[PDB]
Amino acid sequence: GGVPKSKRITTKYMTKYERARVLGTRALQIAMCAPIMVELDGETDPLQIAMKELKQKKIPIIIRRYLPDHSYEDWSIDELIMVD
Amino acid sequence: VPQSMETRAEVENIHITPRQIITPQANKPVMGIVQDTLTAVRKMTKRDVFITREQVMNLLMFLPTWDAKMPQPCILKPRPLWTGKQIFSLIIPGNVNMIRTHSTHPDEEDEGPYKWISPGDTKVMVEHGELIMGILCKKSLGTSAGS
Amino acid sequence: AGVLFEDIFNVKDMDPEGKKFDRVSRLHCESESFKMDLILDINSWLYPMELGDKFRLVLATTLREDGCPDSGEYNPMEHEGTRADSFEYVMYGKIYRIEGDEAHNEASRLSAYVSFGGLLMRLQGDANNLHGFEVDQHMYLLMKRLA
Amino acid sequence: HINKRLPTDLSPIRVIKGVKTLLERCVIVTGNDRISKQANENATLLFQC
Amino acid sequence: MNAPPTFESFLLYEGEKKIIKELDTKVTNAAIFTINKEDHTLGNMIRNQLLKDPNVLFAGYKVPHPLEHKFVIRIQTTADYSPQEAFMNAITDLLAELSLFEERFKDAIKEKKEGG
């Protein structure tokens, strides 16, 4: 059930339940020595690297939001807008 | 202790204390200033509390968010003296504006001519993130809504 | 230069409802040149007063005699050689509200409320004698007892 | 630093346009359908008031 | 079972510098001096000798924790006088003052014992 991009009716604002898991998964990926997309300013805790590369929205994670009718919408990181 | 660091990220982004300040049960804070800390907040905002340069100097280093810009004293001559509201003003950050009343506020004061100048220092006014008027209590620095 | 208000005052009332603070005296005063009415909060122990006394009062925007504004920060150097040397009571604060005509009343009656950290000033009278007063403006009070 | 004793430069037509743009941009139930619009002004009725 | 040793309140560990100087960046000519393994005594002496100096504008000690024997002093002066030189003059004046205290106490004990 691939929902088209113009057909997506979910919200365009990424909530904190997505934020925690994307931050943890990306920091874990960096913890297995993934390439870091942005410049490093001496940070050694990869969770901090996960935030400071989430600021420029350069994280390759596709969020598969599940609708109640067993259909799924794929949302990218840069399509969603940071809010806190 | 979390044994996976993505769960540690979940603790940081969800389970941390400052992200859980306001309850969804009754839209109120759950932590508050209590016991002798609240008692000395009540006793420190009083109008007769005139505090010297040395004592506010002692109180200065316990504000790590301070911008190292000390205020001009309320009393300049003959002795430089501060007050309790002037040093609680440094604690309050940002733009904070607030109207409440003390628990010992008379009801006849609000319709009188002294509703904006209280002899008893009861109505509590905060303007622009600095403490201006009133003595704080459980109503202003507690778990109640609108604090 | 910068003297927004300048008058001699006489005290007519001392604690009309009772003394609620140990170190704060509340005074009711009237002038002689411009018919003003004033409610004063001062330090009681530092500078004691009694009923019927006379005091010279200057309300200015800065302590600099050339009219230039101050730096806004306290230093223990620049308090002598200025306009504060001719007065024994030098306060520094900010006006928080101005009452009177507002929007829908005549401008023959005006009032200004000044907060010195908890000490309260109510200066009320004619609006043309209260020129230069605005909301959230820093203010200097100079006061000297007279025989 | 708004002065409450000085004249302002805010026209009421700009105020009404800002309120209308606010109420158009503050949506909860999305969609151009009649049911979606009815739920949109049913969810935000007290906020609009 | 988790009781700390009682000699750690006055003894530095291996490779532990007593005085750590940190340059403050909020204002100019300001520094923070961190001194370990001591208490409010030396900080109070340094502070109340510094407060007599008109050349200083900021001199203050703080103990962050009663369980951690460590205290910090923030000193800011004018732009003609170092905070480190201010602290040096403070401890020099303290040493001179309590040397005068030692000799006046010795003279007092001598005259009280000889006077009977």
Side-chain angles (χ1 to χ4, degrees), chain B residues 47-50 69 71-77 80-81 83 85 113-114 116-119 121 127 130 132, chain C residues 17 21-24 26 41 43 72 79 84 87 90-92 94 96-97 99 115-118 120 122 140:
Chain B
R47 198 176 293 176
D48 54 353
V49 180
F50 288 100
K69 194 269 172 173
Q72 193 169 4
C74 165
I75 302 172
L76 294 163
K77 271 189 65 178
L81 295 189
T83 185
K85 308 185 185 55
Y114 304 134
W116 289 107
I117 170 162
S118 291
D121 201 79
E127 276 208 335
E130 47 198 358
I132 304 300
Chain C
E17 80 193 2
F21 296 108
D22 295 347
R23 289 189 292 270
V24 162
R26 170 150 287 198
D41 285 339
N43 205 325
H79 289 88
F87 294 93
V90 185
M91 296 299 104
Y92 167 73
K94 187 172 73 176
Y96 58 95
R97 69 179 287 121
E99 264 180 353
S115 170
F116 295 107
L120 295 183
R122 194 178 80 182
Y140 286 83

Side-chain angles (χ1 to χ4, degrees), chain E residues 21-60:
Chain E
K21 179 176 182 178
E22 183 173 329
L23 273 298
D24 208 303
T25 61
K26 290 186 283 187
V27 292
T28 71
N29 291 316
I32 297 169
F33 297 95
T34 309
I35 294 91
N36 292 312
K37 312 307 182 290
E38 279 303 311
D39 51 352
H40 298 258
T41 293
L42 291 179
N44 200 2
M45 289 331 303
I46 288 156
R47 195 163 175 171
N48 277 181
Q49 196 52 238
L50 268 164
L51 286 188
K52 297 191 69 176
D53 203 345
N55 277 299
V56 71
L57 320 166
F58 202 96

Side-chain angles (χ1 to χ4, degrees), chain C residues 5 7 9 29-39 59 97-102 105-113 121-131 133, chain D residues 5:
Chain C
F5 187 76
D7 214 325
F9 283 74
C29 311
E30 290 191 359
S31 296
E32 289 165 46
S33 66
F34 299 101
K35 299 288 96 175
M36 296 299 104
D37 188 26
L38 187 82
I39 300 173
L59 302 188
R97 69 179 287 121
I98 292 170
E99 264 180 353
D101 61 357
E102 291 184 353
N105 290 318
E106 197 47 51
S108 59
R109 178 63 173 81
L110 209 76
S111 308
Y113 293 78
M121 283 321 313
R122 194 178 80 182
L123 171 65
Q124 62 269 20
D126 216 332
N128 49 75
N129 303 142
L130 299 178
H131 270 93
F133 291 165
Chain D
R5 297 172 66 245

Side-chain angles (χ1 to χ4, degrees), chain B residues 5-6 13 16 25-26 42 52 83-84 109 129 134 136:
Chain B
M5 49 67 78
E6 57 268 13
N13 297 133
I16 211 65
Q25 158 173 351
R42 191 221 76 88
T52 69
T83 185
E109 194 168 296
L136 313 162

